[PDB]
Structure formats: C-alpha cells, structure tokens
Amino acid sequence: HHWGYGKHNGPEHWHKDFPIAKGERQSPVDIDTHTAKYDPSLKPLSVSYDQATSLRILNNGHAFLVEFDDSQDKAVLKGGPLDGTYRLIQFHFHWGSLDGQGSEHTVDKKKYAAELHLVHWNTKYGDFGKAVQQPDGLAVLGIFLKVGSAKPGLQKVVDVLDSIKTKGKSADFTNFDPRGLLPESLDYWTYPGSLTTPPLLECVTWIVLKEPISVSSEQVLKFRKLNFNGEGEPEELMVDNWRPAQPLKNRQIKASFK
Ligand SMILES: [Zn+2]
C-alpha cells in the first residue's frame, strides 16, 4: 500500500506522505509560450551520448526504466542553463490511456501522447543519492511524443516490453543508443522544478525540448499493455502514469529560441 496513479493513491493523495508535493518549485507545469522569456544568455545544449552504456530495463510498477552505467562520464549533458557536467543514469516515459493525454508538461495547455524523461545527475556530488538533496543536483531532459510516423530508434524498447510486463520484472538491455530518441532541433524551455514522482524532491533543472518526436500508434499501444500490478495479482493496465500540471508560483520559464 503506497503511491500510484489510481483514484485512491493518485497525485491528489501524495501530499499526505510527501508534504513537499505542495511546495514552491513542483513539476510539471504548463508552458505558456507567450509569457516565457527568450534569454540570449542561454548556451546551446551539449548532448554527448556516443559512449552511452545501457544496462537493463525494468518495470518498477510506476513506469519502465532503462538504466545506464553512470560510473564514468560516458553519456553526459552540458551547456544550456547548466553549470558543470551531468551524467545520464536512466530514462523513462509517462503516457496516457488515449492519444489525447499522457504528457506531464503541457504547452499552452496542449497535452501530448507521452513524455520522455532522460535523468542526469551533477557529477560534483559524487552519486545520484547525494545529488537529489541539492537544488542543482539533477537535470532532466523532457521530450514530447506525438502520434504519427513510427520512430525507428524506439522499436528496440518496444520489442522487449513483453518480457517486463509486470512489476518487479527486469531484463538485460545492452547496446541501446539513446541518440535515436532525440528530435532534430535542440531548442528548449528551461525552469527550476522537481521530480514528478515521489519523493518529489525540488532538485531538478528542467530542460524541455520544443520539437516533439513522432511515434506510431502501434508503438504507443504496446506501452499500454504493461501492468502496474505484479505477477499473480489482478491485472491493472499501466496507463495514465502522469502527474497534472502544478502552480508555477514565483518562477520564470526561459526559452533558448525564437
Ligand atoms: Zn518522469
């Protein structure tokens, strides 16, 4: 008995166990494209994933994660609004039960079918556990997914989901190149936020890309076949594992771009 996305343990209930849920820098938020401010000071993002080493894929009962070896600066994120080097540790998605919902961040109230999160931690802090306790500990790259043409680079992930259908299941997932999940343009918004799942720490510097990638209906459909439950329990489809937009409060969203 803990947190989830159901009617009795969903986002609206999280504050009881995680008071920070009502904090000053919570995520996600709605990106109001007309109030975001263009900042000429923002540098272009620098994504260096050529030496990435994926290790395993697992279904943690809330989403599925693809874990990477973060023992060295193999896959890092630099530049943009960041000061230092951030190592990629894992990526996961949030998606809906229908193509009209699923993303966590919204753009002018527009919801996308899903949202990809590539989580990186600031190397100055030694390890992920220490980084989450700092205001500039994490830097999460958010990418929107819209339904249209298939994304070749995503098929490898889609094909292994059958092996990790239920909570607790994990499978070897080596030699996966995350570069196949990036859009053509790296233009971004950025704002200070938090992790959108418990424990909801406000240690994130969010970097949400303007350009969505397209995925086919067939690809997203396979996401919807996963289970929140563990093997041997009543089947509950893993859909709508997204948190609604939170109050922006005293924060400003900056844009790299036009
Ligand atoms: Zn996420």
Return d(Cα 153, Cα 118) in angstroms, integer: 15
Q: How far apart are the first and last CA of the chain?
A: 47
The annotation status of 94 as a binding-site residue, yes or no, is yes
Distances (CA, A) of 56 to 17, 90, 212, 253: 30, 10, 26, 34
| Spatial CB neighbours of 236, under 8 Å, sequence gap ≥ 6 | 6, 227, 228, 229
The annotation status of 53 as a binding-site residue, yes or no, is no
| All residues with CB under 5 Å from ion ligand 1 | 117
The Å distance, Cα 246 to ligand 1 centre, comes to: 14
The residue to which tokens 């009962």 are assigned: 61
Return d(Cα 215, Cα 3) in angstroms, integer: 29
Contact between 77 and 86 (Cβ < 8 Å): yes
CA quadruple 249, 143, 39, 247: dihedral, nearest 10: -10
Is 62 part of the annotated catalytic residue set? yes
Can you give the CATH number for the domain in which 63 is found?
3.10.200.10
The annotation status of 1 as a binding-site residue, yes or no, is no
Distances (CA, A) of 14 to 102, 114, 127, 161, 248: 19, 22, 26, 28, 18
Return d(Cα 43, Cα 190) in angstroms, integer: 12
Which structural domain, as residue segments, surrounds residue 61? Answer: 1-258
Determine phi and psi for 177, rounding to 5 degrees.
-100, 110
Return d(Cα 17, Cα 244) in angstroms, integer: 18
Distances (CA, A) of 189 to 51, 57, 121, 256: 26, 29, 19, 6
Q: Which residue stretches of 83-198 are H helix?
A: 128-131, 155-160
Instruction: Please report the sign of the dihedral spanned by the C-alpha atoms of residue 61, residue 67, residue 70, residue 75.
Output: negative
- The neighbour count for residue 164, using CB atoms within 10 Å, is 21
Resolution (angstroms) stands at: 1.6
Return d(Cα 76, Cα 104) in angstroms, integer: 24
Structure-determination approach: X-ray
The Å distance, Cα 118 to ligand 1 centre, comes to: 8
How many structural domains compose the chain? 1
At residue 75, the 3 state secondary structure works out as coil
DSSP-assigned letter for residue 4: -
Written as six digits, the tokens of 214 are: 């397209």
The Å distance, Cα 40 to ligand 1 centre, comes to: 28
Name the nearest CA neighbour of 241 among 103, 143, 56, 99: 103
